[model samples]
Target: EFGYIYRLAQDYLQCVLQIPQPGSGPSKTSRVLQNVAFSVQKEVEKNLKSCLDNVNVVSVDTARTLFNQVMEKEFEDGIINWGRIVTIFAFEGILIKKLLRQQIAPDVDTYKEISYFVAEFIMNNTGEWIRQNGGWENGFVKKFEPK
Candidate 1:
């Protein structure tokens, strides 16, 4: 779920920024992964119904709680993978971007500075956990997308 949302957001950003999407070979796999990720994201959104609204108004505390929940659920079997941690980062990144965008004010300079600070704070704290938890290691799974 984390990877799908992350890669889907990334692909959308690439398209919106006018950057070309990836090419064939491994890059082709990325497109496939992105598509699967998008599908899963939509399914989760549909199931939760209220999740997207929570994302829009997500606080640092809420994000932290979500992270902890992921850690508990995903690691319940005692298997930790780098991709899972990356998913957490991606999820938080999307939330932070939305949160900062919502804070746009009349003061452009102030907005940029404050946004930067908020982003850094979120990244630093969440990233610290990933670092402490033996960091990212490839799990046995080769593809992030679901079948």
Candidate 2:
């Protein structure tokens, strides 16, 4: 899991730092970046499957505890960027959702469970941060909007 995360981050960083120049046809650099991104996405899927196989259901309580621990460590490491923290939390939520779905029978129930788990975890861990930036009513979107 660590290796996969490291490789994905590395690949993504490289792609960002070496974006292809604008052109009519797809450039070699663009092709390379696309390939690497696709590979990393596939790796994430494989890792998610392996992780879900090991866990049946991810309860809100368990997810909160685990996510808090992760956030604590990041805080200790001086990771204060709300955007980065949110990204990590989102990834954690996705993993929790996948695990929860493994034990759920229907997609609707699984989605509801995931929503509950993620909302609780975020509220418990980063509620203050969210409130400081803008309350839930204000709406929270990604810093980088798609073009």
Candidate 3:
């Protein structure tokens, strides 16, 4: 679910990736990525607040860092794994839709937009990071035992 992405993006900075600084001029892709991350994060918080519920919040900057990590992975794979990423995106969308339906019937398009925003966020951030770092450096997250 998207809650997971939000949680991951939020924790990603402290737990996985390096958070980007504010006022830093990211590339066009990075800017779009940041916008999407910020948009979804804001919507989620607003929706939760309206329902007298609160979800864990991740700063937009941190989400950008986390999204960038996944972007690095696709680049490493040499082609975007559209299937995988799209599936993850769709799953998150469906989960959010169902949750909202249970209580308040919010616009599905809005929720769908969140998923799109998150996907774009990951794509752009990852692309920018790969361009800058030449690779990702999430430490243990990237480590694996020899097969």
Best-matching candidate per TM-score: 2
lDDT of 1 by residue, 1-147 (tens): 334333434553343233535574224434554444345444545676665566543354454455456546765675544445334334444444444455333222222332233345334444455445532232212445346
TM-score of 3: 0.25
TM-scores for the candidates: 0.39, 0.41, 0.25
Better of 1 and 2 by lDDT: 2
- For model 1, the superposed segments whose C-alpha errors exceed 4 Å read 1-26, 55-72, 79-147
- Candidate number of the best lDDT: 2
Query: Of the pair 2 and 3, which is ahead by TM-score?
Result: 2
Off by over 4 Å in 2: 1-53, 56-80, 96-101, 104-107, 134-142
Give Cα-based local distance difference scores for all models: 0.43, 0.44, 0.38
In terms of lDDT, which candidate is stronger, 1 or 3?
1
Where does candidate 3 have its weakest 10-residue lDDT segment?
138-147
Error of 2 at 125 (Å): 1.9
Query: What's the ranking of the predictions by TM-score, best on top?
Result: 2, 1, 3
Worst 10 residues of 1 by lDDT: 106-115
Summarize candidate 3's per-residue lDDT along 1-147 as a digit string, tens digits. 334344333322221123343454343333333334344544644665555232221333333343445446645655543233333333343234334444243443334344455645654544444334332223211322122
